[PDB]
Ligand binder design. Structure first.
Ligand SMILES: *[C@@H]1O[C@H](CO)[C@@H](O)[C@H](O)[C@H]1NC(C)=O
Ligand SMILES: *[C@@H]1O[C@H](CO)[C@@H](O)[C@H](O)[C@H]1NC(C)=O
Lengths: 413, 412
């Protein structure tokens, strides 16, 4: 068979350098393993390498060792072509459904294997796509069911780096699709950022943005230190779960979760990621990492720019960002008060379902609640994905769309 | 000697019925004990007894037994005359410094005793006075020092019902003034509301507002069920501390604290509150109460009105929540601008160890509030919650010019 991959960075902006650095590093790792460029589809906004703030024009790095990972990465879906619609069309292997981009798709055969890696922002039941796009978990599961039904592959492995990423699969991912999934976090935890300015081992001092994400660099650094003909998918999962837990300190670490067909964990990793002949296998028998969560990276980036000195212009941008977050947080809190009463709003909106249950029972209701909210309160933006469990809980409570319209009108109009 | 009292409700509005009900109940208790009306000064906005929402016009009750406590209460300082300036002038006993009101003051003699009871809203280092007035703790301590210096009394007992009320005395109340103080809560705890609609023992069903406050009804119900010629100030403190703790469940109770001269705890309570002749032979000196948080009572009152009705009430709830969010967000943003994103909240929210003053420079505290309100608008009663953030900005060494810049960016 043939090995294929789909690598997706769901964000943009220099502050989010790390998501595109993670995806570029994954591309280089797969090419070194012998996967062919024609079988790897890359989604990256592509605004980082030549960004005016990049201290190394034309270069992207993903760890303090400073090796460029940008040269040679294909421009399959970049800019406004990085959309959920193109991602689904690419996975399905239907070139007629793609809009723009290179036209490269996963037109795979039954004997082939596929590896999907996403890095970005997210929230309960959702992943980000650039410029305020939201990708819903059930729509992604639906694409996997369609791909499986058309006999497009033998096995698939999916790695997802995003906040509350366990919520994209919990209670909804079937185990009969020949798909194995791991996520950076459980359904109620944040994802963590690594290689930030001021941390040790020291990233190059010219960088003002973080270089990578914890779970992402954990799997990539693990692959590029083992002979992948001998390391199994299970061995990588355990090593990534250990590193991402950050010495089991869940105040600065997360629980890596697994979903889908666990029989795939017995497979050798080279069947999905290739084999790099240069790698000297490092036997199994590292230091605690200084990390920040995805949601905190933005203000830290702006504050670093303010401290490195236009000085009052950065302070105004920080104020606008904080005010925007406060507007979204306050509007959601207020909707809970109007729907359930003071003292009952927060418990309803913030309650987390028992393990194993889906985030929401009706995913079309979830999309409608977001639509009604944004029509009165404005776009959720990437930050607003944090509030997706509040919208799911309004759906699950039995509150009607007409009642949500009334509460949003009072809260925001 | 002569026994004097000053009773103050620091709030207004039908939602705050309880603070005036507590003060009216205290007045009746003191009159039953033989204190004279001429020696009791009452501060109450006086908007409750005849309020359009009051189901018993001209009546105020302070517990589910429904006994009126309003009839006969004097109108010394009401409406716009309930001010910190008049409270200070009354305590000092200087009628020429009073503006409006009856002119009654505590013109006490060296042999006299004084009892002060305040019930209201508050915050770290501050108490409320009606219509967005803030009374600072050090200004109240200063009045006590002045009154002591002029030999105006033998001993004084002060009971304070307000959120974070321990912060009004911690690190600043001297023990050499012949003044003993108890507070409903410690310096970092809220105070609790009793007799709310829907709770048991059931208040009369026609009430949509809470009837009293936990620490306040604890001391008053204790006083009126005992012979005060035998009960000491210490016995009342221990009984009030036990009841206010609500079976030591500090998720629905608070820590009653004591400050000042603890030698006064050995005194019989009748020397301050009088003796009710009907209590002579009562036995010598309970169920868990359902209580509501003092800052939570407002939205619960509006929601009860909404349930018993209306889109106009929902709009009022939205305006209230949006206003609180504006104040909370502006304060949080100022902390980010002054200290940076991962440091603002720890600086603004850090609580000093017990026994330390809230702020080292009280004039700086007033200046920070002044600068904030000039850009962000009035703190209002709710905004008193943020007084520890302003104190922490002062204590951190941040300059007034830096506070001006941060407030201008956050609110202008
Ligand atoms: C996994 O392997 C076991 C043992 O062969 C088998 O019983 C099970 O059905 C397989 N998993 C799935 C998804 O069916
Ligand atoms: C309290 O009484 C004790 C004697 O029991 C005395 O030593 C102390 O100075 C008194 N306190 C004050 C503040 O006078």
């Amino acid at each position: 068979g043939t090995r294929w991959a789909v690598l997706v960075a769901g964000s943009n902006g220099y502050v989010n350098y790390r998501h595109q650095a993670d995806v570029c590093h994954a591309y280089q790792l797969l090419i070194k393993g012998g996967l062919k460029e024609e079988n790897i589809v890359v989604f990256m906004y592509d605004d980082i390498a030549w960004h005016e703030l990049n201290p190394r024009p034309g270069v992207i790095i993903n760890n303090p060792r400073g090796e460029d990972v940008y040269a040679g990465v294909p421009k399959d879906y970049t800019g406004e072509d990085v959309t959920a619609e193109n991602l689904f069309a690419v996975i399905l292997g239907d070139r007629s459904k793609v809009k723009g981009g290179s036209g490269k798709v996963i037109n795979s055969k039954p004997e082939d294997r596929i590896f999907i890696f996403y890095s970005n922002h997210g929230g309960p039941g959702v992943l980000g796509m650039p410029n305020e796009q939201i990708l819903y978990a059930m729509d992604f599961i639906d694409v996997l069911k369609k791909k499986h039904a058309s006999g497009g592959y033998r096995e698939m492995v999916i790695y997802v780096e995003a906040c509350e990423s366990g919520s994209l699969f919990e209670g909804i991912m079937p185990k009969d699709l020949n798909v194995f999934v791991t996520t950076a976090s459980n359904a109620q935890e944040n994802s963590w950022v690594t290689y930030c300015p001021g941390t040790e081992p020291s990233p190059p001092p010219e960088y003002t943005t973080c270089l990578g994400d914890l779970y992402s660099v954990a799997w990539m650094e693990d692959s590029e230190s083992h002979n992948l003909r001998r390391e199994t998918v299970n061995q990588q999962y355990r090593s990534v779960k250990e590193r991402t837990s950050n010495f089991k300190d869940y105040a600065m670490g997360s629980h890596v979760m697994q979903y889908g067909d666990t029989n795939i964990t017995a497979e050798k990793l080279y069947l999905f990621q290739g084999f790099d002949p240069a790698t000297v296998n490092l036997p199994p028998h590292e230091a605690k990492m200084e990390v920040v969560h995805q949601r905190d990276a933005e203000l830290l980036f702006m504050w670093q720019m303010y401290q490195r000195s236009k000085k009052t212009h950065i302070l105004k941008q920080i104020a606008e960002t904080v005010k925007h977050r406060n507007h979204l947080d306050g509007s959601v809190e207020l909707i809970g008060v109007l729907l359930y009463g003071p003292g009952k709003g927060s418990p309803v909106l913030q309650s987390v379902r028992d393990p194993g249950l889906p985030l929401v029972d009706n995913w079309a209701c979830l999309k409608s609640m977001v639509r009604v909210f944004e029509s009165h309160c404005g776009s959720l933006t990437q930050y607003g994905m944090k509030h997706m469990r509040a919208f799911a809980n309004i759906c699950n409570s039995g509150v009607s769309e007409s009642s949500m319209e009334e509460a949003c009108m009072v809260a925001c109009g």
